[PDB]
Design a protein around this nucleic acid. Structure first.
Ligand SMILES: [Mg+2]
Ligand SMILES: [Mg+2]
Ligand SMILES: [Mg+2]
Ligand SMILES: [Mg+2]
Ligand SMILES: [Mg+2]
Lengths: 129, 164, 52, 209, 143
RNA sequence: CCCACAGCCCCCGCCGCGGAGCCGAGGGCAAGCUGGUGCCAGCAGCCGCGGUAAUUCCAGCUCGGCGAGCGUCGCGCGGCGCUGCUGCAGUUGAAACGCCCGUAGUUGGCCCCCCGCCGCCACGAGGAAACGGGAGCGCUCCAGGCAGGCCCGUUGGAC
RNA sequence: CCCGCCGGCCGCCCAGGGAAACCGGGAGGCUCCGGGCUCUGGGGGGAGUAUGGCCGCAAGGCUGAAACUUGAAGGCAUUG
């Protein structure tokens, strides 16, 4: 059965971008998907997207512009301490200069840079670069 | 029990993981001849100290600039390095430390400082003179070749008054 | 059938070398200053022939 | 006698019309003449090394037919590296063929920083991976002063490429030298084909070259 | 996936590893206990025994040689082993009914070289190292 | 001088013992010349050598490594992504139960703007040191120790 | 008749993957290595043997070692 909606969305996005497509459709919508996409948009990877209402299982449309090279999720939400972020950054990211790691906190969904700025920790959602 | 049980102790050097390596042997012999080292334990000691400094610098650099621990530890480390003359005075950033190298450690040895002062003909001559106790630092006789001189004592190194 | 069937020249007397740091001096000079054509090796026949 | 060009690119090189190799690399032009590179390296700045020499036999009606296979790498220690192979009945001719092939194929190598930016790049731009046969290689940027943490064979390639700090990992049957060297070569080749946010700048195409 | 990966699955992973790490020959040989009860030296560097027979053993097929060895009985176990004295002409220094010290070969408990079914080495006889007797550093005029 | 008494270190005078071994030289693995023996004697962690040049045995010459230390045996960590959470494998190399139902167990789509509870993150209190980390101090250096300077944070032993 | 949709059974195949043979309605999207659950394996022999237990009229099935021994055994492919 379906479980991780975000994983399916990200796999579809990467698949489409691989063959240089321009638009994608991901079937189930969710708040977490929306925040993930908003962060991606603010960082400049996926431009604009739209949410289509149908009362059940809202669909989404996203517009691509290359740029993105990889995206993923970490299924079991591990609890990163505030001072334990560097190890995950080194393990997961190609370099310590341009990748982004997403965390969910009591202060909301933000990036690892922002969490380091506020010296707080939380749970990990995913990554993109 | 005896109080001698609470005395601490530790090693001071490391041996390479792959011993028979031609370029390493060549470089080590080259350095030994240049600075007239006795055996290869001195190079291992220098490498150990360099590794300690580099690890401290790495750990500090991983943190944010405005971290209180970072400021404290970096200030202490820079002060020690400057006082010892290993790092140039004009450098006051933690990044510069990672570029340091064992030759900088060697250049602050007593043999080296008395050779660059034209007080000895050669490193070997410097060692022979040091053993015979013809040299002094700040009016005190020092007979340890590996003794390291601080910058403030560089101009205070001279020949022993009582030596013949 | 007898073990030790396989088991005489005298030892040549030559001056002892300078031990300690001095040994490092001559090794440095042996292969960084003093000469050791046809590239170079460590004690092949040709090199030993010249010294003899 | 004298180098007579056999290609349009070769004739252009004979003339002083094109001045840098990076111009050729920017348009992905194949290189077929060994003179097209030595012209840009007149002082023989390119190094040379024979990585391995192996003998290969072919069974026949009367005994075996032996032959030699050689692998050669070349670099100037400034973002250039090449790799080639050659097979011949004689060792010397195989070495010559391998050197020629290595000279022919060459790639630029991108270099970057670990954290603090201090003048000259000292390590790879980011993480790179390669694959040849069963062998896999990972190249991870390292801090300044960390040296080259790698096996003797891979270290020589990284030196000839002009790198100073790097962490490496190998997987598979790494005792097969050619596949290891090929994996590292492919990883280095991939470097200038990875997009980064610094290169997002949109530039208009130009009618030059 | 193939492996369980849920957030509340530590017990299953621990049990899986506990069961499956018994399949390694080395781990079994070390942590099972049979080898210790079967090894005549009971996890000791070397043992002391009495030689009772001097014998020669042929080598394997691709080699051709008769190796010199002795039969020993360990004082603290009373069991029997075969120990081999390697150094040339060192059999003549070993005499029947003599006190010996016997150690192991390089490999823990496997045969070494072309010598079949031999796992022990003679190092001291009558209190003097065999390596020292072979170099003439000392003499066995006490026996 | 020190010491409960004596040594020892250190200081002052007269005479003044300058001594390097252990392993190896086919590969892994840095380092080659005569004489013997002849698949015998022996070497060899593995590959292998020895049936008339033995580059591998036994000797001499020479050479290399570490060095007042060197080598051998057993155990533990590493090597090992060959126990795999990070991070193995499962067509053919070792390995998907003959198939279905099914309880414990594990895992479970989307949605409510704020209330309570559990986990979670951060901070804090409270609770032995020694060890470890670490600030400062020239036991002649060092392994160490918490000292110490005169015109000392209330000199210090912070955390 | 031809133009589609759902479901099923098949063939060839670009990318990609792989030690390769080949797969491609995945053996793809994975060292750039994290969707969920279950089972099995850890060099070759000894050995699916011994000894216990359960089931079965029996033949036998499920479960299942150690000592000891050994330096290769195996896979896909190339030339003869
Ligand atoms: Mg395996
Ligand atoms: Mg089969
Ligand atoms: Mg099988
Ligand atoms: Mg995996
Ligand atoms: Mg087995």
């Amino acid at each position: 059965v379906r479980i991780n909606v975000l994983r399916d969305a990200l796999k579809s996005i990467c698949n489409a971008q691989r063959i240089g497509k321009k638009q994608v459709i991901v079937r189930p919508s969710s708040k977490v998907i929306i925040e993930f996409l908003q962060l991606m948009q603010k960082n400049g990877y996926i431009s604009d997207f739209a949410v289509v209402d149908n009362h059940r299982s809202n669909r989404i449309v996203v517009n691509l512009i290359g740029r993105l090279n990889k995206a993923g999720v970490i299924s079991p939400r591990f609890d990163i301490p505030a001072n334990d972020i560097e190890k995950w950054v080194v393990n997961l990211l190609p370099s310590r200069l341009f990748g982004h790691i997403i965390l969910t906190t009591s202060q909301g969904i933000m990036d690892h840079i922002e969490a380091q700025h506020r010296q707080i920790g939380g749970k990990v959602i995913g990554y993109f670069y | 029990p005896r109080i001698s049980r609470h005395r601490n102790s530790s090693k001071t050097y490391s041996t390479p993981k792959k011993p028979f390596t031609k370029p390493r042997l060549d470089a080590e012999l080259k350095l030994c001849g240049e600075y007239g080292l006795k055996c290869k334990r001195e190079i291992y000691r220098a490498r150990y100290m360099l590794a300690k400094i580099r690890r401290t610098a790495r750990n500090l650099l991983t943190l944010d600039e405005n971290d209180i621990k970072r400021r404290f530890e970096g200030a202490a480390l820079l002060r020690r390095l400057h006082m010892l003359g290993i790092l140039d005075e004009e450098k006051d950033q933690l990044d510069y430390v990672l570029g340091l190298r064992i030759e900088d450690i060697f250049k602050r040895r007593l043999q080296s400082v008395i050779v660059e002062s034209k007080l000895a003909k050669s490193v070997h001559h410097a060692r022979n003179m040091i053993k015979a106790r013809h040299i002094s630092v700040g009016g005190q006789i020092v007979n340890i070749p590996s003794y390291m001189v601080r910058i403030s004592n560089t101009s205070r190194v001279a020949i022993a008054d009582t030596s013949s | 059938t007898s073990a030790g069937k396989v088991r005489k020249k005298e030892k040549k007397e030559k001056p002892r070398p300078p031990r300690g740091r001095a040994y490092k001096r001559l090794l440095y000079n042996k292969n960084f200053v003093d000469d050791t054509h046809n590239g170079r090796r460590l004690g092949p026949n040709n090199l030993l022939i010249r010294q003899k | 006698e004298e180098w007579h060009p056999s290609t349009k690119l070769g004739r252009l090189v004979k003339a002083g019309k094109i001045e840098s190799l990076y111009d050729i690399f920017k348009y992905s032009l194949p290189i077929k003449e060994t003179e097209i590179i030595d012209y840009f390296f007149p002082k023989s700045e390119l190094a040379e090394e024979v990585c391995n020499i192996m003998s290969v036999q072919k069974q026949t009606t009367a005994g075996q037919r032996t032959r030699f296979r050689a692998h050669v790498i070349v670099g100037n220690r400034d973002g250039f590296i090449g790799y080639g192979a050659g097979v011949s009945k004689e060792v010397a001719n195989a070495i010559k063929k391998a050197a020629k092939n290595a000279r022919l194929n060459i790639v630029p190598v991108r270099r970057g920083f670990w954290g603090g930016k201090l003048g000259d790049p000292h390590t790879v731009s980011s993480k790179l991976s390669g694959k040849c046969g069963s062998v896999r290689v990972r190249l991870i940027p390292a801090p300044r002063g960390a040296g080259i943490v790698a096996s003797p064979t891979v270290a020589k390639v990284l030196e000839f490429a002009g790198v100073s700090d790097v962490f490496t990992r190998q997987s598979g049957h790494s005792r097969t030298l050619m596949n290891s060297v090929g994996a590292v070569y492919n990883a280095l080749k991939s470097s200038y084909s990875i997009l980064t946010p610094d290169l997002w700048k949109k530039e208009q195409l130009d009618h030059v070259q | 996936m193939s492996k369980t990966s849920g957030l509340y699955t530590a017990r299953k992973l621990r049990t899986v590893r506990r069961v499956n790490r018994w399949a390694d020959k080395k781990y079994r040989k070390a942590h099972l206990g049979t080898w210790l009860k079967a090894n005549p030296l009971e996890g000791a560097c070397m043992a002391r025994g009495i030689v009772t027979q001097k014998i020669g053993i042929s080598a394997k097929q691709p080699n051709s040689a008769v190796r010199k060895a002795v039969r020993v009985q360990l004082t603290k176990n009373s069991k029997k082993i075969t120990a081999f004295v390697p150094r040339d002409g060192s059999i003549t220094y070993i005499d029947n009914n003599d006190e010996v010290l016997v150690a192991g070969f390089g490999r823990a408990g496997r045969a070494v070289g072309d010598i079949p079914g031999c796992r022990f080495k003679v190092i001291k006889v009558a209190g003097i190292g065999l390596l020292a007797l072979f170099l003439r550093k000392r003499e066995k005029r006490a026996r």
